[PDB]
Amino acid sequence: MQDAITAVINASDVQGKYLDTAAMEKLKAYFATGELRVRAASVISANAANIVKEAVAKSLLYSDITRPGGNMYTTRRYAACIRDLDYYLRYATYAMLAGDPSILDERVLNGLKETYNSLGVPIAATVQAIQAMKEVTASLVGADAGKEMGIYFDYICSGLS
Amino acid sequence: MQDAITAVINASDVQGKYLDTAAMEKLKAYFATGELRVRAASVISANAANIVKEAVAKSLLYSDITRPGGNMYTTRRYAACIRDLDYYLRYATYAMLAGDPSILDERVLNGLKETYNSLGVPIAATVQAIQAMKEVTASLVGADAGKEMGIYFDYICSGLS
Amino acid sequence: MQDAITAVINASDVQGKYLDTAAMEKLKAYFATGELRVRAASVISANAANIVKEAVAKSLLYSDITRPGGNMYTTRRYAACIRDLDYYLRYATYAMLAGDPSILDERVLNGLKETYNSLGVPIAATVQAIQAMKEVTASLVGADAGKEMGIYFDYICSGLS
Amino acid sequence: MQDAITAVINASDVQGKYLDTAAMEKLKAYFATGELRVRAASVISANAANIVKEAVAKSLLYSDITRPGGNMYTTRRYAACIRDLDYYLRYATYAMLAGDPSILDERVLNGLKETYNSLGVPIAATVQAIQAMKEVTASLVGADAGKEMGIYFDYICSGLS
Amino acid sequence: MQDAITAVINASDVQGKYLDTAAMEKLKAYFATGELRVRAASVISANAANIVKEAVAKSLLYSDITRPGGNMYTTRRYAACIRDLDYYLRYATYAMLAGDPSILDERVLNGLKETYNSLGVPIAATVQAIQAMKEVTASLVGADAGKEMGIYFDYICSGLS
Amino acid sequence: FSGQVPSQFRRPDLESRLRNGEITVREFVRTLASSEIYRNRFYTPYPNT
Amino acid sequence: SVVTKSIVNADAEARYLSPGELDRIKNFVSTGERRLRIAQTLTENRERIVKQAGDQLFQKRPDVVSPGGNAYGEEMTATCLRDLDYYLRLVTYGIVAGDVTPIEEIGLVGVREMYNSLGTPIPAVAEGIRAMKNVACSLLSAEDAAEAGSYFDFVIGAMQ
Amino acid sequence: SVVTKSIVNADAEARYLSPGELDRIKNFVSTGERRLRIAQTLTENRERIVKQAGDQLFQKRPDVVSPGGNAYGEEMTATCLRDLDYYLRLVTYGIVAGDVTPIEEIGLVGVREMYNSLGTPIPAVAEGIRAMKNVACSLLSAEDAAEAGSYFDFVIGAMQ
Amino acid sequence: SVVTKSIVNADAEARYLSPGELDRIKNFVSTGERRLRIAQTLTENRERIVKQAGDQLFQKRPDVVSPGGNAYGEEMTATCLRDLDYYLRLVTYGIVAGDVTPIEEIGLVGVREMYNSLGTPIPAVAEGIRAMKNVACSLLSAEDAAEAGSYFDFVIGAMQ
Amino acid sequence: SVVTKSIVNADAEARYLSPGELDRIKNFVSTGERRLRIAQTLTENRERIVKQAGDQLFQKRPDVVSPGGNAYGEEMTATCLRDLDYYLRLVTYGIVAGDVTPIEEIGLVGVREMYNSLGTPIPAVAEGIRAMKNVACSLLSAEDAAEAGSYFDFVIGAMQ
Amino acid sequence: SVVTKSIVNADAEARYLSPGELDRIKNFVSTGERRLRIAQTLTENRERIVKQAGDQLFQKRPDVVSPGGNAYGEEMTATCLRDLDYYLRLVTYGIVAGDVTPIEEIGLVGVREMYNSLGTPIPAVAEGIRAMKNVACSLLSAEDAAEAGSYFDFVIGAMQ
Ligand SMILES: CCC1=C(C)/C(=C/C2=NC(=C\c3[nH]c(/C=C4\NC(=O)[C@H](C)[C@H]4CC)c(C)c3CCC(=O)O)/C(CCC(=O)O)=C2C)NC1=O
Ligand SMILES: CCC1=C(C)/C(=C/C2=NC(=C\c3[nH]c(/C=C4\NC(=O)[C@H](C)[C@H]4CC)c(C)c3CCC(=O)O)/C(CCC(=O)O)=C2C)NC1=O
Ligand SMILES: CCC1=C(C)/C(=C/C2=NC(=C\c3[nH]c(/C=C4\NC(=O)[C@H](C)[C@H]4CC)c(C)c3CCC(=O)O)/C(CCC(=O)O)=C2C)NC1=O
Ligand SMILES: CCC1=C(C)/C(=C/C2=NC(=C\c3[nH]c(/C=C4\NC(=O)[C@H](C)[C@H]4CC)c(C)c3CCC(=O)O)/C(CCC(=O)O)=C2C)NC1=O
Ligand SMILES: CCC1=C(C)/C(=C/C2=NC(=C\c3[nH]c(/C=C4\NC(=O)[C@H](C)[C@H]4CC)c(C)c3CCC(=O)O)/C(CCC(=O)O)=C2C)NC1=O
Ligand SMILES: CCC1=C(C)/C(=C/C2=NC(=C\c3[nH]c(/C=C4\NC(=O)[C@H](C)[C@H]4CC)c(C)c3CCC(=O)O)/C(CCC(=O)O)=C2C)NC1=O
Ligand SMILES: CCC1=C(C)/C(=C/C2=NC(=C\c3[nH]c(/C=C4\NC(=O)[C@H](C)[C@H]4CC)c(C)c3CCC(=O)O)/C(CCC(=O)O)=C2C)NC1=O
Ligand SMILES: CCC1=C(C)/C(=C/C2=NC(=C\c3[nH]c(/C=C4\NC(=O)[C@H](C)[C@H]4CC)c(C)c3CCC(=O)O)/C(CCC(=O)O)=C2C)NC1=O
C-alpha cells in the first residue's frame, strides 16, 4: 500500500536522488487540500449509514432484485448486499483521505469483479446504484469533497469493469 | 448439501410461491419411497465390507495394477485405493438415502478429477470398478434399491470426468 | 453427559447384569415423565429471553449492583451477566430434559466458582438470581415441570455456591 | 536433556574441569555395555506386542479389573490399558538404551501418578502389571540384559508408587 | 493497561460524578509532566542497549553467577538473562512514559516471582541488577526523569522483594 | 464462553473471505489471532508468560 | 430436511447412518402425509390468517402502524404486510419440511441487518408472529397446533 | 439415549433443542414401552439365544474352536461365549436406549485394538453377532425383529 | 488515553514506543488545555443540556413516553433520563481522555445486548444522543464543539 | 505516511478513522510546511554534513579506515561513504514523509545482515550516523533538530 | 550423546528405536575408546594449544588486542582467553560424546546475543577457533585429528 507522500518518496527512491522540489510542491498542495478533505471525511463517517440507506432506497427498494430470485431476494443475500455497499464506502473513504485509490484497488478491487461475475451478482447494476450513492454523497460532502468522491467513484467504475 | 425435500423447497423459494399441489405430490412420492430407501441403506452398512471386497476382487485382483509398476503395486497404494472406494460407496449411500445427488456431487465430485489427475490414478479404471460395485450392491440390496443405487453410481461415473 | 435412561444403563453395566425389574421401573418412570419434559422444554425455549429479563428485574435490577461500582454497572458487564444467566438457563433446560445432573456437572459447574471468585463477581448475587429465575421458570412451565426444573436449577445454584 | 554419557558431561561442565579419570572410566563403562543393551533393545521392539499380551494375561486379565466395573470393563478402557503398558515399555526401552533413569522421569513419570489418581486407575494394579512386564521382558531379553532393563522398569514402578 | 488520565477517569467513574475541577487540575499536572517524560523516554530508548550493558557489567560481569555452575553460566542462561533484563527495561520505559504503574503491575509483575522461583533464577541477583539498571537509566535520562523511571523501577524491585 | 454470542469484535471481512473460499480456515485463524481483537482480550492484559 | 440434518452429522462423523438416525428418518416418512395436510391447511387459510394477525399486530404496536412509524401510510403498511406474508410462506415451508433449517436460510440469516436497514421494529415483528401462532392454533388440531407452535417459536427467536 | 445424542448435538450447536429433535424425543417416549417389552423378551431368552448363536458361529468358522484356534479348549470357549454375552447385554441396553450411544461407548470404541491384542479373530466375532441377529429374529415378533435387527446391525458394522 | 492505545500497539510490535507516537502524545498534551476548558463548559451544562436534549428526544419518540413504551410512567421516564445522563457523563470523560476506547469500555460495548434484555429501543436512544450533539453545538464554541460532536458521533455509531 | 499508518490500523478495525486520529492527521497537515522547510535546509547542507560526519567517523574508527579494516583502501572507504550518504538520503526522505515506518521499510530492515555481508562493523556505522545527527542538529533549527534527533534515534536503534 | 539424540527423534516420532539408529549406537560404542583417547590427548595438550592459538589469533586480529578493541588491555585479553578456554573444554566434551549436542547445549545457543551484548567481534572469535583447530590437527594423530577437525568445524560454523 502507498500513501500519496509515500508514492512521491518511492519515485525519488527509484531515481536514487532526494525528493524533487516539484514533488515537494505536490506534497504541500496535498496537505492543503487534505485539511478540507479530512473535515468532509469526518462528516461522511457520521452519516455513512444514512448514505447507504438512501442509495438502497434509490435503487434496491421496490425492485425486481428484491423480488424473489433476484440475487438479493434472500435474508442472507440482503445482508450481504448492504454489507458490500458499506464496505465499498469505507474503503472509498480511506482512499479519499489518502488521496490515492491504490489501496482500494489493491484490496477492494482485487478480483472483486471476477468474484461478483462468478457469483452472478449484477456488477453494472451495483455500479449504477454506487454512482447514485456517489452523487448524493458528493452533494452532502460539498463540491471539493465531491471531486475526491468522484475519484473514488471512478475507482468503483473500474471495479465494475 | 441438498436433499429431495430441500430441492422442492429451493424450487418453491425461487418461485416465491407456496408449494403447488403437483410439487406436494412429488414430495409425497419421496415420502413413499423413503421406507425402502432407509432399509436399503441399513443393509448397505451391514454388508459394506463384503461389497468392497467383492468389487475390488472383480476390478483389480490378479491384474497388472496389482503387479509391480501397476500403481496399485504398493501396500500404501492398495490401502489408499480401498479407502477411496469405500469413501465413494459411503457418500453415494448417504446421497441415496437423501434421494438427491446434489450432495454427492458437491461433496465428492468437486475437484476430484483434478486431484486424480495429479495422483495419476486411472479414472476410467476406477469407473469400471465403481460400475462393478454398483452391480454387486444391486445384487445384495435388491432390484428396487439397485435402481436408485445405479442412478447415484451413474452420477458418480459422470463425476469421474 | 448422561440421561435418566443412560444412567440406569450405566448402573446396570456396573452391576454386570441384564435389565432387572428395578431397572425396568426406573426407566419406565423416565418414559412416563417424557411428555411433561418435552412440553416444558418447548415453553422454556419460547419464553427464554423473557425469563432472563424477569429474573434480573426481580432480583438484581434497580439495585446497587446495577448502580455504579456494582459489578453490573457497565454495558459490557451487564451484557456479560445476562449472558452467564442465559448459559445457566440453557444448560439447565438441557439437564431437565436429560433427567440427570451429569451435563450440568460436566459443563455448567466446572471451575465456575473459582473463575467467579477471581473476577470478583458475587457468588451470592448469582445464587439469588438463579433462585429468582427458578421461580419465573416454574410459573411459566407449570407445577409438575417446575418441580423438575427446580431440581436441576438447584444443582447449578448449589454448585456455584 | 539427560543421558548417561551426557550426564557425566553435564556434571563436568558444572565443575568446568577437563575430563577426569573417573569421568573417563564411567563413560568407558557405558561404551562397554552398549552392545548388550542394543541387542536386547532390538529384541524387545520385535516382541513388544507379545510382551504386553503376556503381561496382561499374567497380571491384569481374568480378574475383577476386566470384569464389570473394574476400570477395564469397557473396550475403551481396555484399549487405553494396553496402550498405557505399550507406552510404559517404549519409553522404558528408550531409557534402557540411554542407560540413564532420568529420561523416564522426564517424560513417563512427570505427573503420571497425579493423572492416574484423578482418572481412578488403580496405582497398585499398574505397578503389578509393570512387574509382570518386567518378568516377561527379562525372559525374552535374557538375564544379563534383563537385569539392566529391570532396574529401569523398577524405577518406573517406584515413580508410580 | 491503565494511564494517569484514565486513572482519574476511573476514580470519577467509581464515584459516579463528573470530573471535578480539582481532579482536572491533577490531570493537568500529569499533562505538564508528560512533556519532560516524553523527551526523556526518547533518550532512554536510544541508549537502552548501553544501559543494559552497563548494568550487566556492574553485577553480572566477573561474577560467580557467570562462573560455571552459578546458574548464569550457560549460553542459553546468559542469553535469557540478557533478554529478561531487556524485557524489564521495555516495560519500565512504557510505564514511565505512560505515567501510570498499572501497566507494569498488570504484565510484568503477575507471577514473575513465581516464574523465577520455578526456574531457579536468583530473584535477589535480578533485584540488584534492577537497581544497577535504575542508576544507569537515571543518569542517562536526567535527574527529573530519573525520579519517575527510578520510582517505577523501585516499584518493580519492591514487588520482587 | 457461551458459544452463542460472537460479540461485536468479530471480523466480517475474514468471514467474507472464508465464505468465498479465498481464505482457508488455517489462514482465518492466523488473521483472527493476529488481530487487535485477540490482543486486547488476551495479549495486553495477561502477562506474556 | 430432517434427513439433511441427520446426514450432515453422519457425514461429519464419517460413519454410515446409525440405527437410531435411520429410525428418525423412517418416522419422518410415516408422518409425512400428516405434515403435508397441516401445511395444506396453512396455505388454504393463508390470506385470512394474514388479515387477522395484521390487525392484532397493529393493536400491539400502534406507533409502527400509525404515521411516524415504519408502517406509516397504506403503502408502507402494505409493504410490511408483504414481508410478513413472505415470513408466513417460509413458516409453511418449514412446517412441511419438519426442520427449521430451510426457514433459517430463508429469513434468519442476517435478519437483524435486514430489520435495521428497513428501520422497522424487530419486537413488533415478533409480536406479529405470536398473533399468527394464536390464529394457527384456532385453525389447527391440538396435535397440529403444538408442532406448528414449535416452528413458530423458532420464528419468534429468529425475530429476536 | 436418543435424547442424549440430541443433547450432544444441541450443545455443539449452542442452541436449545430443535423442534424436530424434541419430536424424536417424543417418539422415543412413545416407544419406551414397546422397546422395554422387546428387551424383556431378549433377556428372558438370553441363555438359549446365545447358546444357539455360539453353535452357529463355531459351525460357520470351525477354526475359532479347533486346536490352534483362539478359543481352543473349554475355558476359552466359555470366555468366547462371555464376550458374545457382553455384546448381547449391550444390544439389550441399546434397544432400551433407542440409540447407538450405549453400545458405542462400550464395545464399539477401540474394540478392534483390544481383540487384536488378545488374538481373537475380529471377523469371527462379527459373524457371531450376525448369528445372534438371526436367533433374535426367530425369537421376536416381526417388527420387533426389525428394530432389534437394526441395533444388532450397527454392532456388526462396528466390528467390521 | 491515546498514549495507552499507542503503548498497546507498541507492545504487540515488541518495540519501544515510536518517535512519531511520542510526538502524537505531545500534541494531545497541547490539545488537553483547550479540551479541559471545553470539558468545564460541559460540566457546567451537565443538567440543562440533558433536560433540553431529553425534551427533543421525547418529541422524536412519543410512543416510548406513551404507556406500554419502554419509558412508561414517571419512574421509567426518570430511568431513561438517568441512562441518558450516564451516557453524557461518559461522553465528557471520553472527550477529556481523548480516546473513545474509555467510553467504549464503560458503555456501548454490548450495549445492544443490554438493550435487548431491558426492552429499550436503540433507535430512540441514538436519536437522543444526536439531539444532545446538536444542543451541545449550540452550548459550546464551534472549534471545541467539532471535536466533541465527533466523540458523540462515535457513541451514536456504536449504537447504530 | 503517518496518516497512512493510521489508515491501516483503521482498516484492520474495519471502522472509520478515529476522532483523535483524524485530529492528529490535521495536525500533520499543519506540520507539513515546517517539515518541508526543515527538509529543504537539510538537503541544502546535506553534502557538507556528510563530509564532516565522515571525518568524525574516521577519527572514531581509524582502524576501519586503516589496512585490516572494512574501509581499508580508497575503494572500500568510498563504498562506505556511499552507504552512509544513501542512508542519509533515506533519512531525509523519511523525515519529509513524517513516517518512520516508510524509512524502516525502505531500509534498515535486516541491515545488520547487510552489514555482516559487507564486513563492516555495525557499531562503527552507528557512530557515523551519530556524527551525522550532531551535524544535522547544528545545521537545522532547534525545532527542526528535535525532529531530526528522533529520526536519528530510530536510525541508531536500527544500527544497534 | 549421539544415541541420546537418536532417542529424542524416535520419541518424537512415537516409535521404538530404528535398526539404523541401533547400528549408530553400536558403532559409537565400538569407536568410543578411540574417541575418548583422542579427547584425553586434547585435554592433556589443552593449555599449550590454548597459548599457541591465542598468539596466532592476536596476530590475525591485532586491533582487538589493541586499545579500541574488545580485548583492550591485559585484563580484557585475559577474559577473552578464558572464554576461549571454556569453549575448548566444551569442544573436547562434544568430541568424546560423538555428537555436537553437548557442545550446542553448553554454547552456541544464544551465543550471538551474548557476543552482541559484550561487543566482542564474532568473526575474530571464529578465526581464533580456526587457529586452534589447525594447531590441534597438527598436535593430534591423523585419525584423531580427522574427528577433531569435524567437531572444530562445527564450532567454527556456529561462530560464523
Ligand atoms: C425472504 C426473506 C426476506 C424478507 C422478509 C425481506 C423483507 C423486506 N422488507 C423490506 C422493507 C420493509 N419492512 C418493513 C417491516 C415492518 N414495518 C413495520 O412497521 C412492522 C413492525 C414490520 C412488519 C410487520 C417496512 C415498513 C419496510 C419498508 C421500509 C420503508 O420504506 O420505510 C424490504 C425492502 C423493500 C422491498 O421489498 O423492496 C425487504 C426486501 N426481504 C427478504 O429477502
Ligand atoms: C509389494 C507389497 C505388496 C504386497 C505384499 C501385496 C499383497 C497382495 N496380496 C494379495 C492377495 C492374497 N494374499 C494372500 C496371503 C496369504 N494367505 C495366506 O494364507 C498366508 C497367511 C498369506 C501369505 C503368506 C492370499 C491368499 C491372497 C489371495 C486372495 C484371494 O485371491 O482370494 C493381493 C491381490 C491379488 C494380487 O496379487 O493381484 C495383493 C496385491 N501387494 C503389494 O503391493
Ligand atoms: C455505565 C453504562 C451503563 C448504562 C448506560 C446502563 C443503563 C441502564 N438502563 C436501565 C434501565 C432503562 N433504560 C431505559 C432507556 C430508555 N428508554 C427509553 O424510552 C429511551 C429511548 C431510553 C433512554 C433515552 C429504560 C426505559 C429503563 C428501565 C427499564 C425498565 O425497567 O422497565 C438499567 C436497568 C435498571 C437499573 O439500573 O437497575 C440499566 C442498568 N447501565 C450501565 O451500567
Ligand atoms: C463453565 C461455563 C462458564 C462460566 C460460568 C463462565 C464464567 C465467566 N464469567 C466471567 C466474567 C463475568 N461474569 C459476570 C457476571 C455477573 N455479573 C453480575 O453482576 C452477576 C452477579 C453475575 C451473573 C449474573 C461479569 C460482570 C464478568 C466480568 C465482565 C468484565 O468485567 O469483563 C468470565 C471472564 C471472562 C469474561 O469477562 O467473560 C468467565 C470465564 N465462563 C464459562 O465458560
Ligand atoms: C465391554 C467390551 C469388552 C469385551 C467384549 C471383553 C471381552 C474379553 N474377551 C477376552 C478373552 C477372549 N476372547 C476370545 C474371543 C473369541 N475366541 C473365539 O474363537 C471367537 C471367534 C471369539 C468370540 C466369539 C477368546 C478366545 C479369549 C481368551 C483368550 C485367551 O485366554 O487365550 C478377554 C480377556 C480375558 C479376560 O476376560 O480377562 C476380555 C476382557 N472385554 C471387554 O471390556
Ligand atoms: C560456557 C559458554 C560461555 C561463554 C563463552 C561465555 C562468555 C563470556 N565472555 C565474556 C566477556 C568477554 N569476552 C571477550 C571475548 C573476546 N574478545 C576478543 O577480542 C576476542 C576476539 C574474543 C575471544 C577470543 C572479552 C574481551 C570479554 C570481556 C569484556 C568486558 O568485560 O569488557 C563474559 C562477561 C564477563 C563474565 O564472564 O562475567 C561472558 C559471560 N559465557 C558463557 O557462559
Ligand atoms: C513480559 C516480559 C517477560 C519477562 C520478564 C519474562 C521472564 C522470563 N525469564 C525466563 C528465563 C530466565 N531468566 C534468567 C535470568 C537471570 N539469570 C540470572 O543469573 C540473572 C540473575 C537473571 C537476569 C537478570 C535465566 C537464566 C532464565 C532461563 C532459565 C533456564 O532455563 O535455565 C523465562 C523462561 C522462558 C525463557 O527461557 O525465556 C521467562 C518467561 N518473560 C517475559 O515474557
Ligand atoms: C475488501 C472488502 C470486501 C468486498 C467488497 C467483498 C465482496 C464480497 N461480496 C460477497 C458476497 C455478496 N455480495 C452481494 C452483493 C449484491 N447483491 C446485489 O443484488 C447488489 C447488486 C449487490 C450489493 C450492492 C451478495 C448478494 C453476496 C452474497 C452472495 C452469496 O454467497 O449468496 C462475497 C462472497 C463471500 C461472502 O461475503 O459471503 C465477497 C467476497 N468482500 C470483502 O471483504
Side-chain angles (χ1 to χ4, degrees), chain G residues 14 16 73:
Chain G
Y16 289 81

mmCIF file of all heavy atoms in Angstrom, chain G residues 13-16 18 22 49 63-64 66 73 82 84 86 92 99 120 133 135 139-140 160, unseen atoms left out:
data_model
loop_
_atom_site.group_PDB
_atom_site.id
_atom_site.type_symbol
_atom_site.label_atom_id
_atom_site.label_comp_id
_atom_site.label_asym_id
_atom_site.label_seq_id
_atom_site.Cartn_x
_atom_site.Cartn_y
_atom_site.Cartn_z
ATOM 1 N N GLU G 13 -19.176 -37.281 11.061
ATOM 2 C CA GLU G 13 -18.623 -38.430 11.768
ATOM 3 C C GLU G 13 -17.991 -39.452 10.832
ATOM 4 O O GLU G 13 -17.281 -40.343 11.313
ATOM 5 C CB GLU G 13 -19.711 -39.105 12.605
ATOM 6 N N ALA G 14 -18.227 -39.342 9.522
ATOM 7 C CA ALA G 14 -17.720 -40.293 8.529
ATOM 8 C C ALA G 14 -18.175 -41.718 8.835
ATOM 9 O O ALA G 14 -17.419 -42.679 8.678
ATOM 10 C CB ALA G 14 -16.195 -40.222 8.414
ATOM 11 N N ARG G 15 -19.423 -41.859 9.271
ATOM 12 C CA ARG G 15 -19.999 -43.156 9.590
ATOM 13 C C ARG G 15 -21.318 -43.325 8.855
ATOM 14 O O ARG G 15 -22.071 -42.361 8.690
ATOM 15 C CB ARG G 15 -20.224 -43.311 11.097
ATOM 16 N N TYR G 16 -21.590 -44.551 8.412
ATOM 17 C CA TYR G 16 -22.903 -44.865 7.867
ATOM 18 C C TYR G 16 -23.974 -44.571 8.910
ATOM 19 O O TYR G 16 -23.718 -44.601 10.117
ATOM 20 C CB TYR G 16 -22.971 -46.331 7.432
ATOM 21 C CG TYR G 16 -22.167 -46.659 6.193
ATOM 22 C CD1 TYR G 16 -20.801 -46.887 6.267
ATOM 23 C CD2 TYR G 16 -22.778 -46.754 4.951
ATOM 24 C CE1 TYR G 16 -20.064 -47.191 5.137
ATOM 25 C CE2 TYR G 16 -22.049 -47.059 3.817
ATOM 26 C CZ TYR G 16 -20.693 -47.276 3.916
ATOM 27 O OH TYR G 16 -19.964 -47.580 2.789
ATOM 28 N N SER G 18 -26.573 -44.238 11.664
ATOM 29 C CA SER G 18 -26.790 -45.059 12.839
ATOM 30 C C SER G 18 -28.213 -45.608 12.852
ATOM 31 O O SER G 18 -29.104 -45.067 12.191
ATOM 32 C CB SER G 18 -26.531 -44.250 14.106
ATOM 33 N N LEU G 22 -31.519 -43.619 11.375
ATOM 34 C CA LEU G 22 -32.374 -44.199 10.347
ATOM 35 C C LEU G 22 -33.816 -44.291 10.828
ATOM 36 O O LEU G 22 -34.753 -44.061 10.056
ATOM 37 C CB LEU G 22 -31.849 -45.577 9.944
ATOM 38 N N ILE G 49 -55.607 -15.689 7.708
ATOM 39 C CA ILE G 49 -54.693 -15.602 8.844
ATOM 40 C C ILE G 49 -53.873 -14.322 8.767
ATOM 41 O O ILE G 49 -53.634 -13.659 9.783
ATOM 42 C CB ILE G 49 -53.792 -16.849 8.903
ATOM 43 N N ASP G 63 -47.749 2.529 17.283
ATOM 44 C CA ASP G 63 -46.862 3.558 16.747
ATOM 45 C C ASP G 63 -46.321 3.170 15.377
ATOM 46 O O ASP G 63 -46.274 4.001 14.462
ATOM 47 C CB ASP G 63 -45.713 3.818 17.717
ATOM 48 N N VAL G 64 -45.903 1.914 15.219
ATOM 49 C CA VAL G 64 -45.425 1.452 13.920
ATOM 50 C C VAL G 64 -46.546 1.517 12.892
ATOM 51 O O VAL G 64 -46.335 1.928 11.744
ATOM 52 C CB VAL G 64 -44.845 0.031 14.038
ATOM 53 N N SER G 66 -49.136 3.487 12.943
ATOM 54 C CA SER G 66 -49.516 4.869 12.711
ATOM 55 C C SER G 66 -48.471 5.595 11.871
ATOM 56 O O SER G 66 -47.338 5.129 11.726
ATOM 57 C CB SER G 66 -49.704 5.591 14.041
ATOM 58 N N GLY G 73 -48.532 5.050 6.647
ATOM 59 C CA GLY G 73 -49.288 5.106 5.416
ATOM 60 C C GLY G 73 -49.668 3.727 4.906
ATOM 61 O O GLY G 73 -49.119 2.702 5.311
ATOM 62 N N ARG G 82 -46.578 -7.475 3.248
ATOM 63 C CA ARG G 82 -45.999 -8.371 2.253
ATOM 64 C C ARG G 82 -44.784 -9.101 2.810
ATOM 65 O O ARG G 82 -44.606 -10.300 2.564
ATOM 66 C CB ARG G 82 -45.626 -7.589 0.996
ATOM 67 N N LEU G 84 -44.345 -9.767 5.978
ATOM 68 C CA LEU G 84 -44.921 -10.735 6.906
ATOM 69 C C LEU G 84 -45.484 -11.941 6.165
ATOM 70 O O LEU G 84 -45.395 -13.075 6.651
ATOM 71 C CB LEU G 84 -46.006 -10.068 7.751
ATOM 72 N N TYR G 86 -44.342 -13.157 3.321
ATOM 73 C CA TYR G 86 -43.188 -13.974 2.964
ATOM 74 C C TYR G 86 -42.726 -14.806 4.153
ATOM 75 O O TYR G 86 -42.373 -15.981 3.998
ATOM 76 C CB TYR G 86 -42.054 -13.087 2.448
ATOM 77 N N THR G 92 -44.659 -21.992 6.536
ATOM 78 C CA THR G 92 -45.345 -23.150 5.973
ATOM 79 C C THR G 92 -44.353 -24.133 5.367
ATOM 80 O O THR G 92 -44.481 -25.349 5.550
ATOM 81 C CB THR G 92 -46.361 -22.703 4.923
ATOM 82 N N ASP G 99 -37.999 -29.514 9.558
ATOM 83 C CA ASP G 99 -36.764 -28.952 10.080
ATOM 84 C C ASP G 99 -36.773 -27.450 9.850
ATOM 85 O O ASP G 99 -37.172 -26.980 8.781
ATOM 86 C CB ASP G 99 -35.535 -29.580 9.414
ATOM 87 N N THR G 120 -37.428 -0.875 10.686
ATOM 88 C CA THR G 120 -38.618 -1.365 11.362
ATOM 89 C C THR G 120 -38.281 -2.024 12.697
ATOM 90 O O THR G 120 -37.138 -2.417 12.940
ATOM 91 C CB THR G 120 -39.345 -2.361 10.471
ATOM 92 N N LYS G 133 -49.386 -17.350 15.537
ATOM 93 C CA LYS G 133 -49.441 -18.600 16.288
ATOM 94 C C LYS G 133 -50.822 -18.824 16.893
ATOM 95 O O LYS G 133 -51.344 -19.945 16.867
ATOM 96 C CB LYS G 133 -48.369 -18.606 17.378
ATOM 97 N N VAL G 135 -53.706 -17.614 15.764
ATOM 98 C CA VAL G 135 -54.624 -17.922 14.670
ATOM 99 C C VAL G 135 -54.427 -19.357 14.199
ATOM 100 O O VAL G 135 -55.395 -20.068 13.901
ATOM 101 C CB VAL G 135 -54.441 -16.917 13.519
ATOM 102 N N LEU G 139 -57.009 -22.588 13.903
ATOM 103 C CA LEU G 139 -57.273 -23.251 12.631
ATOM 104 C C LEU G 139 -56.623 -24.627 12.511
ATOM 105 O O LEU G 139 -56.692 -25.234 11.438
ATOM 106 C CB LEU G 139 -56.813 -22.363 11.471
ATOM 107 N N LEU G 140 -55.997 -25.134 13.571
ATOM 108 C CA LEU G 140 -55.348 -26.436 13.526
ATOM 109 C C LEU G 140 -55.828 -27.310 14.677
ATOM 110 O O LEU G 140 -56.372 -26.825 15.673
ATOM 111 C CB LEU G 140 -53.820 -26.307 13.579
ATOM 112 N N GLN G 160 -36.349 -12.162 17.332
ATOM 113 C CA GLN G 160 -35.491 -11.577 18.355
ATOM 114 C C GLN G 160 -34.037 -11.565 17.896
ATOM 115 O O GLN G 160 -33.513 -10.529 17.486
ATOM 116 C CB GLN G 160 -35.620 -12.343 19.673
#
